Amino acid sequence: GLPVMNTPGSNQFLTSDDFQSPSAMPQFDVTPELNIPGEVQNLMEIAEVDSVVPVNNVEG
Amino acid sequence: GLPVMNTPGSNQFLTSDDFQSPSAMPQFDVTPELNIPGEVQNLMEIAEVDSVVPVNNVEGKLDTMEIYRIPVQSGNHQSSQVFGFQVQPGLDNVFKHTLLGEILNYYAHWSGSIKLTFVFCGSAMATGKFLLAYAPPGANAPKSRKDAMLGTHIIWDVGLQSSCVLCIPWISQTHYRLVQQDEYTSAGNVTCWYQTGIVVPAGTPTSCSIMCFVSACNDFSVRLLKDTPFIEQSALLQ
Amino acid sequence: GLPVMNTPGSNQFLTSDDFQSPSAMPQFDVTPELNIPGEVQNLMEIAEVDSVVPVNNVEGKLDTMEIYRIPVQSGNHQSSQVFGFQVQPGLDNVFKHTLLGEILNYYAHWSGSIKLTFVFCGSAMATGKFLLAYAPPGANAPKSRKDAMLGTHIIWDVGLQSSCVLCIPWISQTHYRLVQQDEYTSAGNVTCWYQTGIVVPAGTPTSCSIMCFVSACNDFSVRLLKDTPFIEQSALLQ
Amino acid sequence: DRVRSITLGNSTITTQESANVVVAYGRWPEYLKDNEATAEDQPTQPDVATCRFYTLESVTWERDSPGWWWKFPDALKDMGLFGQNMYYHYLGRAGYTIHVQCNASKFHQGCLMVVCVPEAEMGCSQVDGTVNEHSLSEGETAKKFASTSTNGTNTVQSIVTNAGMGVGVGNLTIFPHQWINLRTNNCATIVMPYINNVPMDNMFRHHNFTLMIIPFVPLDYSSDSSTYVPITVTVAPMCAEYNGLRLATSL
Amino acid sequence: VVEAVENAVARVADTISSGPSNSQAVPALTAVETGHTSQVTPSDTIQTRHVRNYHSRSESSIENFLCRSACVYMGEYHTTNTDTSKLFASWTINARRMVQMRRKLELFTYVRFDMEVTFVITSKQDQGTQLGQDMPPLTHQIMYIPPGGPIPKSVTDYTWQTSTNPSIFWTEGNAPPRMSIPFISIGNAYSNFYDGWSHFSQNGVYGYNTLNHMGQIYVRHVNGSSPLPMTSTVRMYFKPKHVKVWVPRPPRLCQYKNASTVNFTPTNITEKRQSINYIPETVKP
Amino acid sequence: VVEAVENAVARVADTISSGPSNSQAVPALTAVETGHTSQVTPSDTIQTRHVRNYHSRSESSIENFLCRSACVYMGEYHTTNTDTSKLFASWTINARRMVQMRRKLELFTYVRFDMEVTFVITSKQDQGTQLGQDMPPLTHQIMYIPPGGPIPKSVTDYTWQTSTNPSIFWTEGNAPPRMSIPFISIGNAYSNFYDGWSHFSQNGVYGYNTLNHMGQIYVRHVNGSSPLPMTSTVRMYFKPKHVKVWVPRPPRLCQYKNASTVNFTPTNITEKRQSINYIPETVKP
Amino acid sequence: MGAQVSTQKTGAHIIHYTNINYYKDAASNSANRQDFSQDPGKFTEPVKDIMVKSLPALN
Amino acid sequence: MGAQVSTQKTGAHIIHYTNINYYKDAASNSANRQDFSQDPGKFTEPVKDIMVKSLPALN
Amino acid sequence: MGAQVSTQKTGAHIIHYTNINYYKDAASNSANRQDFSQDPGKFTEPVKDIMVKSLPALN
Ligand SMILES: CCCCCCCCCCCCC/C=C/[C@H](O)[C@H](N)CO
Numbered sequence A: 001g002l003p004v005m006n007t008p009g010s011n012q013f014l015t016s017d018d019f020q021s022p023s024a025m026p027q028f029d030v031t032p033e034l035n036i037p038g039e040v041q042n043l044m045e046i047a048e049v050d051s052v053v054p055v056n057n058v059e060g
Numbered sequence B, C: 001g002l003p004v005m006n007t008p009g010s011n012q013f014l015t016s017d018d019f020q021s022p023s024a025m026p027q028f029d030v031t032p033e034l035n036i037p038g039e040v041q042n043l044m045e046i047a048e049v050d051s052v053v054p055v056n057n058v059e060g061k062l063d064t065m066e067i068y069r070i071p072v073q074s075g076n077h078q079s080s081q082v083f084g085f086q087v088q089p090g091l092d093n094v095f096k097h098t099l100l101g102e103i104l105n106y107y108a109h110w111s112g113s114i115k116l117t118f119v120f121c122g123s124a125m126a127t128g129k130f131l132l133a134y135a136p137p138g139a140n141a142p143k144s145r146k147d148a149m150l151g152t153h154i155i156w157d158v159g160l161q162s163s164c165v166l167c168i169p170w171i172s173q174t175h176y177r178l179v180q181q182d183e184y185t186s187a188g189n190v191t192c193w194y195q196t197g198i199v200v201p202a203g204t205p206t207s208c209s210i211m212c213f214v215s216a217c218n219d220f221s222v223r224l225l226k227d228t229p230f231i232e233q234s235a236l237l238q
Numbered sequence D: 001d002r003v004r005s006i007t008l009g010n011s012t013i014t015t016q017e018s019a020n021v022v023v024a025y026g027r028w029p030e031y032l033k034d035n036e037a038t039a040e041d042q043p044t045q046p047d048v049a050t051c052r053f054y055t056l057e058s059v060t061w062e063r064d065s066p067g068w069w070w071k072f073p074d075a076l077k078d079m080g081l082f083g084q085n086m087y088y089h090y091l092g093r094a095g096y097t098i099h100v101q102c103n104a105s106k107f108h109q110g111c112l113m114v115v116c117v118p119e120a121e122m123g124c125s126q127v128d129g130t131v132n133e134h135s136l137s138e139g140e141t142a143k144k145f146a147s148t149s150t151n152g153t154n155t156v157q158s159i160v161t162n163a164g165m166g167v168g169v170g171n172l173t174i175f176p177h178q179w180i181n182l183r184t185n186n187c188a189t190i191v192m193p194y195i196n197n198v199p200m201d202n203m204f205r206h207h208n209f210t211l212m213i214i215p216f217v218p219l220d221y222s223s224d225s226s227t228y229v230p231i232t233v234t235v236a237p238m239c240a241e242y243n244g245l246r247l248a249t250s251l
Numbered sequence E, F: 001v002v003e004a005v006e007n008a009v010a011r012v013a014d015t016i017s018s019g020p021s022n023s024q025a026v027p028a029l030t031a032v033e034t035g036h037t038s039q040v041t042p043s044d045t046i047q048t049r050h051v052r053n054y055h056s057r058s059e060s061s062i063e064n065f066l067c068r069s070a071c072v073y074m075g076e077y078h079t080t081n082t083d084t085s086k087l088f089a090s091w092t093i094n095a096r097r098m099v100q101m102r103r104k105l106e107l108f109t110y111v112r113f114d115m116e117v118t119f120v121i122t123s124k125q126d127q128g129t130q131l132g133q134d135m136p137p138l139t140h141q142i143m144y145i146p147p148g149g150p151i152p153k154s155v156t157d158y159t160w161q162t163s164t165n166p167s168i169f170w171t172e173g174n175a176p177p178r179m180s181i182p183f184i185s186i187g188n189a190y191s192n193f194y195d196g197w198s199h200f201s202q203n204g205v206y207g208y209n210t211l212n213h214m215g216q217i218y219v220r221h222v223n224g225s226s227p228l229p230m231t232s233t234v235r236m237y238f239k240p241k242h243v244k245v246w247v248p249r250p251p252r253l254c255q256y257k258n259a260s261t262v263n264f265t266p267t268n269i270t271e272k273r274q275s276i277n278y279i280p281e282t283v284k285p
Numbered sequence G, H, I: 001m002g003a004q005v006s007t008q009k010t011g012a013h014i015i016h017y018t019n020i021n022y023y024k025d026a027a028s029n030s031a032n033r034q035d036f037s038q039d040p041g042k043f044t045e046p047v048k049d050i051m052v053k054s055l056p057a058l059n
């Protein structure tokens, strides 16, 4: 067939990789999407909300 | 050659994959296609065909044709209930071996409306009217005609047309229910009562029977393929 | 490099594959092509050539030229049958070592029409007429000329033209028959009878012989390659 | 809407209480075309000597009757010129019109299922055994389903609930069928095309389809109503073709 | 060059809105005697709202229903024995010995398709008193013999030359072997049921074995070795594709008995309950 | 860039419809003395219907007939011995030792093609009383020597330098080695039969061995190791492609005797039967 | 180069893929998983005369 | 990029494939399995004068 | 052949890449790492009447 050469990194499991993989359930038909209130798109939206600070953290 | 890198999943055998493979018989010339009647394109075409329901599945009748007949008779029997069962098209003993049930037991999820057709098989001189009722989940099954009349029902009048259809509509909080139904995805119950009673003239048999057919409507569908629990072997060559 | 995943079938040797491979002699310059007479492009061109059939394969004649001659003579012999055999072009001892038979034994399925040519090799003063008949499967072989005349037949008149062709047409319920024919794919039988008899003048030999040639028509084809059972060895260097 | 007339050859059937007509899969019988043929000789087409209604012999529907079946062809092998054309050829091909009649009074009751099953392969009452053809068919006489499990050798396992095929009898509605409900109609009619995996076939070796008549609601009546209620079958071949003429076979 | 291929999505029907009615139209009155199944929807019997349904019947098409791999045969063979017939495995090809795939196929009378075939081979050591040796990788040969070809008599027979038969050579530790087969039958479609005989006198062989005739499989070890004996097991998996089926049938109720016949033992229609009115109560405090 | 290549499908002839006839045309009367074969079809002798035939002669073309792999040689060699000639294998190249491929090739007088060559190598342990050791993977060398090149005398001879000869190095557990060879002959086509001599005085060597002269193959182990002896077997497989053949011949009837000659023992034409009329009866009750 | 581009199976309330055929026989191609036709009337309505469903079945 | 697209072997009563050549020698290419020509008259009718087949062979 | 070309993540103060989809299901595709939208007002300002931020909150 086509000549090829393997590079370092072959057959490793990196836990932050981004590849394609075969599906174990071909042509599965998913439930339709519902428009639920309160969708979050970025974690910085939560950090912009006020929360109470425990300033008096002394013994007792 | 070209540099490459192997990812996880290499050299595995997944039984639902979809790849290309080399042919062991290059350039084989197949027999031409013939136009045979009765071609099937979807399993839902089979589930839309009526089949007879064994409503009378009590002790002593599991291997006779009496398992298919519902008994009715003349006289004052208004306080007696005719029949009743749960709506579990793949779980209940009443529905599990019919065409619709057999198709559903290959799948995990189902959804849609269900048709029940009732046919009266008495003499041409017998008259009567019946009440056919479906109750949604949330309460216990009705114990009298007054309770049953509050749900979804139809009043069947026996005449020149022999058949009446009760359509069970899809009323559910989820899009799909489990074929292996639990208390969370319950669907309700069906019951039958005398609306007036059976009246016959002299010279006619008093007892009659009713038959029930089940099929699926045109909004019905299933998903999540699985193996069926109805077939099994203990060794090869079987 | 490029991410890839290996599928089942990797690193196997399939003896009918079709791939590319590196050359062990780069840029080798081949001898120019010469236009030699008699080039063959398809094996069906060989099976369309007549070859002689050993119809007389009885004990004591398997290694003499007498195996090829069919005997006929003058006098009242109408009740005697001339010859008969089954139609099994790759199975019967009568057809298996001819050109057509030898080509068919490399394959599993065959289909098409078959030509049988008969040549009379008597004196120029002998006259006679014969009946050549083919019967389809479903009954036993005919025992008299009256039975044989009911199938597909031809009446051969001996004269200045020496040869007559009986064409066996493809009459079958399946598109193909097996080369290793069984009772399910049987094809029938062929028989020969005296239509009038042989008449000669004084001074001529009484006995004569007939020869038979077999070949394939222009609708004939085979499929499903296999190894032949006619050649074998017990060790290398043979 | 309830009256019907069917003419074939020199025979005609009238009816005054019919439901409708079932056309097996939406396909009417027809002759074989040129781009689907394999046999090369010119076929014969008798066209009125074979394509006509033949009547079999009747059965008696009793209060406890399990049901009956016939095999087609081989139930018409002694019927006129259809049978004679069957005996002299190697290959045959035909569709059929089936008509079942059973009448009764407005004081009787009962319900019959009339179904045609293609390739109905049957099993033996001995599980370590094989069937023979006498147990499968008796020509124009009907075989009888049973009431319980059968035993002994060489007989077909014929308890009605399994239909002798290892299935549930209530699912036979997947095939072409009709019902005779004694209060509604008195006849059933099915039009069946040629159904096989090859374009022609030998008619002595292969049973193309089985006809089953099974009562779901038994026959009942009262004091002095008629007790004898017969059932009658009538079959007509359509678009009949034959190939491969030789001497007549002998069974 | 690139070619755009369009795929039509197929969803189920929407339910339409319906209100009260008082007329002569009687959609709920029918007659089953005709052989016709009623085409009534909920909107013909009750009052309904409008719903837009997005569900699809994609996983119930015949191709998605049948295109999965299933085991059809398992067999054993040795490297060293005193029988010389247990040194290789051989069997006739069909799909009638494992009940799951064969019940799934028998929902139809006739079927036509190509096939994808996979093999899974494993080996193990035979129980001996003295253990301990290093063995090189084992190689296996699989040969397909179409009907009429010569049959091997041993593991050293000349027939493993495989000059014209297709074979597979494989060594342990690699991916499982795989190859595809076209639609090989002398008929126009496969036959799952045959109500006929083999001889014109209406006797002989009855049923399915009359029509299949598709060859055999032979498997052996190639090393010819191993003073300490080993044992291998081979399993075969079928996967149909490019499918067409005709004439649906009722599903098999009784259990299977053997691979040749449709023989069965009488079984019930279902299991019982208390009485024709029995209801399980589930709303209790 | 993309280029569309068209492939013409070739099917067999249709049969046309024909009716009754009474004339002077005599299509069924011929004369075989001319050397001509009659071109008559069923429609010339009987009445026929019209049939559209879709069958194709695709699997009987020469390329599909000959393009499969066949074994042509098998040989053994050791890692340790007391002979030093059994440490490597060597043979002269031809296709005359395995009867299946060689009978298939001899249907024609002359042939011309390229080749694809595959090797299948296996190893095994020699029977000794004391077993038990771990051995590293074995490596093998295959060298092709065209006529005139130097010949190895041992497994350590300088000639395995393979500076100009092509060689293959391989290690066990991988896919089988493979390479392709072009049409290498000093003539315009290969010759399967040669009715001539080598010397101009009409003596010397007769027949096939006069013309082939295509070199030799040598195979050895590379490790040079193994205090406990091992034994390897090598098998070679040929597959012709891009084929052309001329002048067909009748197929071989007698069995082969040796690889050099066409020598044979007289054989019969076929086996016998009862009499010239014998018919097996198969329709009996 | 003989490439086919077609849409992927998604939901409802970038989405296409590419295929190349590598072998000479069509029996080597992958399965046809994206063909969804139906014809139920062949099994549920096999009658000669049409039935309207708002009219009586008989009379 | 020097790609060839041609039709696959199918039946009768999406279907093409792609090939690229990787090597410099034509002896490395795969087999030519899709060429179907015939010329039987070379072996069955090798006569100088034409024979009509409805006419007698002699006279 | 159904190829997508898009820009790579770089810095600020040749840069694109190519993707082909190999499988029939969209659940087999790689992650969508390059979509950056925001809507914080849903959680920080969920009030009926608008508040200007230069005006007093009350009165
Ligand atoms: C040695 C390499 C090739 C391996 C040989 C595998 C070829 C198997 C033959 C193909 C048979 C597939 C079709 C047969 C299945 C039956 O027809 C089904 N049970 C329905 O009839």
Ligand SMILES: CCCCCCCCCCCCC/C=C/[C@H](O)[C@H](N)CO
Pocket (backbone or CB within 6 Å): C024, F093, F094, F095, F096, F105, F111, F115, F117, F142, F143, F144, F166, F167, F168, F179, F181, F184, F190, F191, F192, F214
């Ligand atoms: C070491 C790597 C290369 C391996 C050497 C293999 C080369 C073999 C030489 C090519 C010979 C092929 C053609 C010979 C076959 C005969 O001609 C046929 N029997 C017909 O004559």
